[PDB]
């Protein structure tokens, strides 16, 4: 039997995979059963380990979801938000000091998640039950007298 690759892992083939592998540091796999076709990015698939969004970051290889940059606290009352320079990164840098800003990020944001599959049907109705033994016939009367 075949086993589906767990969350945070992807199969290294579209059809006949030999071993699931962990998603890279900059990516994340939300689903169960991720597979990596070879058409475009190597570690990317329709359900595969997606790269973390612009704001969000993750560093652990096999992870379900990324996390947002934490608010940097340099001392008293200094909560400065942080962002990422590139599309997928495992380190979140200050948003003030990044070179390419939110202004120049020309990537277009990917579609929403396609809907969730229907449920399993009920158990089918068993075929009918066997009719009982049919009845017997009449019995031969005793020989008429002579």
């Amino acid at each position: 039997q075949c086993t589906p690759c767990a969350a945070g892992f992807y199969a290294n083939a579209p059809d006949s995979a030999t071993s699931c592998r962990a998603c890279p540091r900059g990516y994340y796999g939300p689903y169960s059963g991720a597979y990596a076709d070879n058409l475009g990015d190597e570690f990317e698939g329709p359900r595969g380990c997606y790269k973390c969004p612009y704001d969000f970051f993750a560093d652990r290889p096999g992870v379900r979801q990324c996390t947002a940059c934490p608010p940097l606290d340099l001392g008293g009352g200094n909560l400065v938000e942080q962002c990422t320079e590139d599309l997928g990164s495992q380190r979140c840098k200050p948003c003030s000091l990044l070179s390419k800003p939110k202004t120049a990020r020309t990537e277009q944001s990917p579609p929403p998640p396609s809907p969730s599959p229907p449920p399993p049907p009920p158990p089918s109705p068993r075929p009918p039950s066997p009719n009982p033994p049919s009845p017997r016939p009449p019995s031969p009367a005793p020989p008429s007298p002579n």
């Binding site: 699931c20 560093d59 652990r60």
Partner: protein
């Protein structure tokens, strides 16, 4: 004579390989000014 019994299931399948830790936290604290 009646039929024989069924088999027992397989065990519990293996667990995914435990992930590694994280980076070594930072690099250069503060390079000297000019």
């Amino acid at each position: 004579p009646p039929p024989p019994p069924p088999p027992p299931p397989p065990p519990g399948t293996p667990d995914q390989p435990a992930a590694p830790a994280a980076p070594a936290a930072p690099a250069a604290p503060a390079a000297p000014p000019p």
